[PDB]
Amino acid sequence: TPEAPYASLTEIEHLVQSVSKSYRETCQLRLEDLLRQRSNIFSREEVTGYQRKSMWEMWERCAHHLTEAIQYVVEFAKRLSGFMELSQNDQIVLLKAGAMEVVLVRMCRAYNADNRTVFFEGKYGGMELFRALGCSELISSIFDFSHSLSALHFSEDEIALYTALVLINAHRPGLQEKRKVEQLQYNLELAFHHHLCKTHRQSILAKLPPKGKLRSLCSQHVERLQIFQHLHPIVVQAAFPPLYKELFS
Ligand SMILES: Cc1c2cc(F)cc1NS(=O)(=O)CCCCC[C@H]1CN(CCN1C(=O)CC1CC1)C2
Ligand SMILES: O=C(O)c1ccc(-c2nn(C(=O)c3c(Cl)cccc3Cl)c3cccc(F)c23)cc1
């Protein structure tokens, strides 16, 4: 069982491998393709074309990409050992709190620190590309957070274990089986620590974002998304109806 006490070196190393595999199979864009596309940057005309779009065109574009990013995180969560064995309540509690945070972490892979650009709809562009949204402060904070994560130079196994820990958090309010979540979290932390020690990457632990900075940024991001959704509702067919009901009712 993934929550079992006295987790062996076999269980811990398979947990590392299984989490990394779940991560790379739920990534919309492969890292090699994001790295290759770094030289493919939007021209002044294309940037002007994005700036001349209405607030509602840019909201619809952005909301569509975020809906897909979330759906991939739900698929990732469902591949995590023990997650599907939790009640629907506990699964919903972990995803409503953790899914956007995971999307925010995953964004660092599409961020280029050299020129401060992000991958958006085929090319790289700066934050000026999102001018029509009228969200420059929140967008600057998202760019700053991805900048800080990109300086860690995460390997696939590291970002995989880190995002799984963002999700399997026993402190999310509303959990019915809090003890079972503490056990799954304990084994993941053990796997994360074991992997960093084995690879001589423990230096990154003191460099990870402070406790609460990720929750705070996600809270501000979701609040803005909920305002746009109330003002100009996006019509989606929910892939996960019980989760969708909690976020949009
Ligand atoms: C595009 C992007 C940004 C930052 C970053 F680090 C990485 C990417 N690239 S990505 O991960 O491949 C794309 C995934 C969609 C994210 C859209 C998100 C962030 N972009 C600004 C618009 N935005 C909003 O939520 C606007 C809402 C508040 C009104 C900038
Ligand atoms: O398909 C499904 O069932 C589904 C279910 C939940 C969501 C979802 N949307 N969401 C937004 O912030 C959001 C809004 Cl408020 C408007 C537009 C775009 C987005 Cl991504 C979340 C935040 C945290 C956790 C979540 F699961 C979601 C998406 C899809």
From Swiss-Prot:
In terms of domain of life, where is this protein from?
Answer: Eukaryota
Compartments, as annotated in UniProt = Nucleus
Tissue-level expression? Isoform 1 is widely expressed in many tissues, including liver and adipose, and highly expressed in skeletal muscle. Isoform 2 is primarily expressed in immature thymocytes.
Q: Motif span (AF-2)?
A: 243-248
Induction per the UniProt record: Up-regulated in the state of obesity.
Q: Where is the NR LBD domain?
A: 11-249
Q: Which UniProt keywords apply?
A: Activator, Biological rhythms, Developmental protein, Disease variant, DNA-binding, Metal-binding, Nucleus, Receptor, Transcription, Transcription regulation, Zinc, Zinc-finger
The entry lists its GO molecular-function terms as: DNA-binding transcription factor activity; DNA-binding transcription factor activity, RNA polymerase II-specific; DNA-binding transcription repressor activity, RNA polymerase II-specific; ligand-modulated transcription factor activity; nuclear receptor activity; oxysterol binding; RNA polymerase II cis-regulatory region sequence-specific DNA binding; sequence-specific double-stranded DNA binding
Q: Name one GO biological process term.
A: negative regulation of thymocyte apoptotic process
Q: Which GO terms describe its cellular component?
A: chromatin; nuclear body; nucleoplasm; nucleus
Q: Which disease is it linked to?
A: Immunodeficiency 42: An autosomal recessive primary immunodeficiency characterized by increased susceptibility to concomitant candidiasis and mycobacteriosis. Candidiasis is characterized by persistent and/or recurrent infections of the skin, nails and mucous membranes caused by organisms of the genus Candida. Mycobacteriosis is characterized by infections caused by moderately virulent mycobacterial species, such as Bacillus Calmette-Guerin (BCG) vaccine, environmental non-tuberculous mycobacteria, and by the more virulent Mycobacterium tuberculosis.
The task this protein performs is described as: Nuclear receptor that binds DNA as a monomer to ROR response elements (RORE) containing a single core motif half-site 5'-AGGTCA-3' preceded by a short A-T-rich sequence. Key regulator of cellular differentiation, immunity, peripheral circadian rhythm as well as lipid, steroid, xenobiotics and glucose metabolism. Considered to have intrinsic transcriptional activity, have some natural ligands like oxysterols that act as agonists (25-hydroxycholesterol) or inverse agonists (7-oxygenated sterols), enhancing or repressing the transcriptional activity, respectively.
Identify its protein family. Belongs to the nuclear hormone receptor family. NR1 subfamily.
Subunit structure, briefly?
Answer: Interacts (via AF-2 motif) with the coactivator NCOA2 (via LXXLL motif). Interacts with the corepressor NCOR1. Interacts with CRY1. Interacts (via AF-2 motif) with the coactivators NCOA1 and PPARGC1A (via LXXLL motif). Interacts (via AF-2 motif) with PROX1. Interacts with FOXP3. Interacts with NR0B2.
What UniProt notes about the protein's domains is: The AF-2 (activation function-2) motif is required for recruiting coregulators containing LXXLL motifs such as NCOA1 and NCOA2.
Q: Return the protein name.
A: Nuclear receptor ROR-gamma
Q: Which residues of the full protein are shown?
A: 259 to 507 of 518
